Assembly symmetry: C4
Homo-oligomer: 25 residues x 4
Amino acid sequence: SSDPLVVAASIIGILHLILWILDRL
Amino acid sequence: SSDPLVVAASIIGILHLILWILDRL
Amino acid sequence: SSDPLVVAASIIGILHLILWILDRL
Amino acid sequence: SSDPLVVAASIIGILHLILWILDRL
Ligand SMILES: N[C@]12C[C@H]3C[C@H](C[C@H](C3)C1)C2
């Protein structure tokens, strides 16, 4: 495993991408 | 701990998310 | 190498940048 | 040091923030 801030941030940068893309569509 | 660029960047990707979301609302 | 979530996220933050920039233009 | 993809990505997430903020203003 890695540290929970690093991992958490990673997931965020995925979720925030979907939201942004969804908004555009 | 980790390195301050890595950690700092992590926090940014959270703050930038809130700002973006807040703007949408 | 590093872990595939970390690396994958890195690439995303690049692709998402291009898309955003392209949209602005 | 860390790996150049990780570091590079970190900087990007800062630059992309400024650009986004500047655009809003
Ligand atoms: N946006 C990023 C969040 C976190 C730190 C850095 C590298 C990875 C993980 C993607 C920038």
